[PDB]
Amino acid sequence: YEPKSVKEIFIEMKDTVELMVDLAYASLLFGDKEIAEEVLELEERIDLLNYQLMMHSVLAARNVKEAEQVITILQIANAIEDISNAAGDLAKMVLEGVELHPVIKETILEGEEIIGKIQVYPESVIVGKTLGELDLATNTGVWIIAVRRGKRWIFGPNENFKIRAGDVLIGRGTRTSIDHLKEIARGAIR
């Protein structure tokens, strides 16, 4: 097997917790238990990555200097793991199925950065293009955290994900950044 680097593990942890928090808010906004389940699965991945980070750090360091440095990484991962647990706490509320105060969904839809649901029509120019080819985060500011395609979810889609008419994109971004993408998705803006 090809060994992983500390940086690769660390980057995945950071990237994953960010996605986790976004998905946690999405689960609350949509009262969606499947999204909530995904958050919990990611919390487990975070525990696994944290374990590997500790293993790598323990094995890599043999003297005091090296030790002091790997400890800084473990300390940061520790804080990251706390954020993952908080996202999991939010997800659990959705799985418990509690009736949320109406202000909650409004809050997620009206803050600086919001979560939006975008319907893709056949006439849109993004149909048939991949997220990478598109680089939506780069070119629209809207970051796609998930896609609902029929009876299935694609969480954290990669650059190879090709968009189809009928897809429902779950994006994170500013309000005007979400409405802009909706225009493009409706084919209004070519």
Site string for a copy of itself, 99-138 (x = CB under 8 A): xxx-xx-xxx-xxxx---------------------x-xx
Q: Does 66 bind Ca ion (CB under 5 A)?
A: no
- Choosing from 40, 54, 93, 127, the residue that interacts with a copy of itself (CB under 8 A) is 93
Q: Report the residue number, 78 or 139, with the smaller CB distance to Ca ion.
A: 78
What are the residues facing 173 on neighbouring strands?
114
89 three-class SS? helix
Cα–Cα distance between 180 and 183 in angstroms, integer?
A: 5
Q: Does 59 bind a copy of itself (CB under 8 A)?
A: no
Q: Cα–Cα–Cα angle for 110, 120, 12, nearest 5°?
A: 65
* Residue 32 marked as a ligand binder: no
Q: Report the residue number, 126 or 142, with the smaller CB distance to Cl ion.
A: 126
Tokens of 7: 């940086």
Distance of CA 51 to the CA centre of its chain: 21
* Residue 135 marked as a ligand binder: no
Q: Which of 171, 157, 25 has its CA nearest to residue 91? A: 25
Which amino acid is located at 15 in the chain? D
- Choosing from 3, 5, 59, 138, the residue that interacts with Cl ion (CB under 5 A) is 5
Q: Does 151 bind Ca ion (CB under 5 A)?
A: yes
Q: Report the residue number, 102 or 122, with the smaller CB distance to a copy of itself.
A: 102
Give residues after which the chain gaps, C-N over 2.5 angstroms.
Answer: none
Q: Which of 172, 32, 177, 175 has its CA nearest to residue 115? A: 172
Residue 28 C-beta: closest distance to a copy of itself, Å? 7
What residue ranges bind a copy of itself (CB under 8 A)? Answer: 6-7, 10-11, 14-15, 18, 21, 28, 68-70, 72-73, 75-76, 78-80, 82-83, 85-87, 89-90, 93, 98-101, 103-104, 106-108, 110-113, 135, 137-143, 173-177, 180
